[PDB]
Design a protein around this ligand. Structure first.
Ligand SMILES: COC(=O)c1ccc(S(N)(=O)=O)cc1
Length: 284
């Protein structure tokens, strides 16, 4: 069923809360035993948001390999994403170790460091060229190279150095700065513009490791970003673009990380972004 018609049918019937609860009921449940070990309590921002054991990213160290991060592998779309929490004071070194070990080109940040008057994630990147950051626990150095500030997002060029081998890589930081403190954006125009800028960078492409995507918990806004990208790619690839079922793509993604899309408003916004974005994909 053409999702644009399914959309008007749910809107006119005001049944978004009912569709959303149906997804919550059918979603996969897999063990998260490593996340719940007592040694890992200060590595988790939220007690009710954990990576599944089968899809968790492992740090390459014998001490403690744990980080709150999941690999979302979309077989038909041929895209992979790492979804993670906003880093905490005691996990900023682990975060950059993961970026290094997984060979990521891009980091996508969908939150502000402070929202609703509380800290939603650590200041994990340098704000001035001449004041670089050293992570002594993982032996990495991070320098700000350049910053391009626009009305709805900021793009930064960063240099990550492995202090053990003196190799360096360029990382791109894509920072969506205008998601509102409550609810979802009124139009998806600026969110789709942002997604097309990440794609244009090469950060989502198979020659690199998976893109790292985060918000505060790494399930809500993060979920919206990867769901919209995957649905638009499948509409490009298939003979029948109307066959793309957003609820079925979301359930496939929930096999890899719990809770993706946190509200009925985020589900509705995801439909709107795919419907408005398709009017480019189908030749405009
Ligand atoms: C190496 O860098 C750090 O050790 C570090 C720790 C915490 C914060 S934070 N959460 O206060 O912003 C920022 C940076």
């Amino acid at each position: 069923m053409e999702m644009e018609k399914e959309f008007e049918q749910i809107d006119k019937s005001g049944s978004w809360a009912a569709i959303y609860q149906d997804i919550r009921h059918e979603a996969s449940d897999f063990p998260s035993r490593v996340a719940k070990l007592p040694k890992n309590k200060n590595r988790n921002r939220y007690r009710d948001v954990s990576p599944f054991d089968h899809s968790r990213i492992k740090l390459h160290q014998e001490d403690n390999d744990y980080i709150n991060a999941s690999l979302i592998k979309m077989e038909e779309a041929q895209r992979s994403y790492i979804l993670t929490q906003g880093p905490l004071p005691n996990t900023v070194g682990h975060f950059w170790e993961m970026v290094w070990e997984q060979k990521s080109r891009g980091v996508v940040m969908l939150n502000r460091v402070m929202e609703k008057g509380s800290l939603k994630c650590a200041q994990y990147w340098p704000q001035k060229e001449e004041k670089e950051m050293i992570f002594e626990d993982t032996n990495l150095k991070l320098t700000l190279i350049s910053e391009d500030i626009k009305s709805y997002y900021t793009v930064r060029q960063l240099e990550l150095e492995n202090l053990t081998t003196q190799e360096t890589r360029e990382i791109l930081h894509f920072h969506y700065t205008t998601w509102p403190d409550f609810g979802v954006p009124e139009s998806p125009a600026s969110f789709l513009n942002f997604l097309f800028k990440v794609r244009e960078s090469g950060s989502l492409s198979p020659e690199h490791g998976p893109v790292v995507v985060h918000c505060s918990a790494g399930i809500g806004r993060s979920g919206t970003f990867c769901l919209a990208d995957t649905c638009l790619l499948l509409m490009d690839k298939r003979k029948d673009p109307s066959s793309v079922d957003i609820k079925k793509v979301l359930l496939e993604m929930r096999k890899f990380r719990m809770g993706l899309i946190q509200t009925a408003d985020q589900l509705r916004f995801s439909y709107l972004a795919v419907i408005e974005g398709a009017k480019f994909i189908m030749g405009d």
